Design a protein around this ligand. Structure first.
Ligand SMILES: CCCCCC
Ligand SMILES: CCCCCC
Ligand SMILES: CCCCCC
Ligand SMILES: CCCCCC
Ligand SMILES: CCCCCC
Ligand SMILES: CCCCCC
Ligand SMILES: CCCCCC
Ligand SMILES: CCCCCC
Ligand SMILES: CCCCCC
Ligand SMILES: CCCCCC
Lengths: 95, 131, 10, 131, 95, 10
């Protein structure tokens, strides 16, 4: 575990292309990124995957799971925030 | 991040560290506003755990970090422990974050938001740099 | 939201 | 249990089912006494979740099950999310279990307790029977 | 996921013998069982591993993790209750 | 503890 905050650029893959690595473990509320030479790893979980949209950094994914070895050739799996923003908006409104 | 780079101090404002009462960082998180933090459901966050904002160097005692207490854990009820699907939990802070030059909120997308394959984004955190 | 006071450098 | 057998109704008294407010069983557990339930730290149990004792058939509505509310989650602070070590959490019930012919406590070993390799034991639960 | 409660007999292995399958992932507060033809699987987690001692069923392990495929040739990993009973006794006393 | 009213059958 590093003492200071790290960062890594990486591309978004398609679920179809990601099912080639993970098959049927990839579900609708999951979005893959990686296989680029970098990899999120144990301790990064819960963390953010951000992309810029209209020059503002916006939450696209949550560090969920991937390779047990954090393989940088194997795509990481993040929770698809786009599919989970409705529940978040519902929760914040009511609480 | 295996093969990542050291971030610039203060540059990823919304990034917070989830740590138990032992001081141990187990998961990361993101400030969506001054009273709410989004993390993963699989992280297993309780209220004995604390949210730490405004941090860069975990081994630096001079930093003006913000130790935030969790009031309630809102796990997404569509979360599936067996498939690890719908892995998102909200954390209501009992004590609100003070937004500064280093502590702030990341933007949330619209359900309709579109992010194509081949698009380059960024991931951050204090997870293993090697395995 | 989404626009840090300290800017990222990748 | 992949390749297991159907248990005899009521024969594993301490076995409880952890389910969210959606009705979904995500984890198992064990009654150590009428107000405390032991489960895994990685299960991620909140207080929105419920403990169900006295159950055999999850699809049977005629069963006299006991839906128990969780008051507090006591995660072991030596629990390591990264290695998944010290994976044990206690659940203090806000409402005490009524012990019966089907609801009771399993015994806890002494720290000094010894269990040799080659010794045959038993595991129970409602987890996938196939993958 | 089955509707009714299942059960399975299985032997306890040695950590040394278990490190042959899992290596350095096996830590001191973990105890293996399985590779016998049965396997605990997703949804069994948190559950009990009991052995009889003096004719009383006693908690020896907690269903933790194992094979992603729930392989019945590969040993499952349970939390070693023997190593975790001191903390439990401390917690119940104080609360 | 450890002794069920309904007995297991393996
Ligand atoms: C183009 C450089 C990528 C570095 C990480 C694999
Ligand atoms: C996040 C930095 C990793 C460097 C070692 C691969
Ligand atoms: C830009 C960060 C440099 C240290 C890690 C390669
Ligand atoms: C949530 C918006 C806060 C703005 C304070 C002026
Ligand atoms: C994270 C930057 C916040 C911009 C709005 C005050
Ligand atoms: C627990 C029963 C499993 C039967 C199918 C392998
Ligand atoms: C003794 C249980 C029989 C059904 C599963 C083989
Ligand atoms: C915990 C022991 C209870 C016994 C009731 C007579
Ligand atoms: C001796 C019978 C064992 C059955 C499960 C593999
Ligand atoms: C689980 C059996 C309990 C025996 C003591 C009343």
């Amino acid at each position: 575990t590093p003492d200071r905050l790290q960062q890594a650029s990486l591309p978004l893959l398609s679920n179809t292309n990601c099912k080639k690595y993970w098959g049927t473990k990839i579900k609708d509320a999951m979005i893959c990124a990686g296989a680029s030479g970098v990899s999120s790893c144990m301790g990064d979980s819960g963390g953010p995957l951000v992309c810029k949209k209209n020059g503002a950094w916006t939450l696209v994914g949550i560090v969920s799971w991937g390779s047990s070895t954090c393989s940088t050739s194997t795509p990481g799996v993040y929770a698809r925030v786009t599919a989970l923003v409705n529940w978040v908006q519902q929760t914040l409104a009511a609480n | 991040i295996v093969n990542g780079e050291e971030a610039v101090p203060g540059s990823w404002p919304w990034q917070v560290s989830l740590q138990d009462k032992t001081g141990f960082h187990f998961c990361g998180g993101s400030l969506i506003n001054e009273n709410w933090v989004v993390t993963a459901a699989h992280c297993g966050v309780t209220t004995s755990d604390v949210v730490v904002a405004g941090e860069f160097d975990q081994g630096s005692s001079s930093e003006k970090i913000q130790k935030l207490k969790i009031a309630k854990v809102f796990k997404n009820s569509k979360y599936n422990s067996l498939t690890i699907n719908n892995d998102i939990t909200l954390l209501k802070l009992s004590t609100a974050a003070s937004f500064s030059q280093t502590v702030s909120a990341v933007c949330l997308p619209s359900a309709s938001d579109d992010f194509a394959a081949g698009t380059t984004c960024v991931t951050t955190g204090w997870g293993l740099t090697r395995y | 939201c989404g626009v840090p006071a300290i800017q990222p450098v990748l």
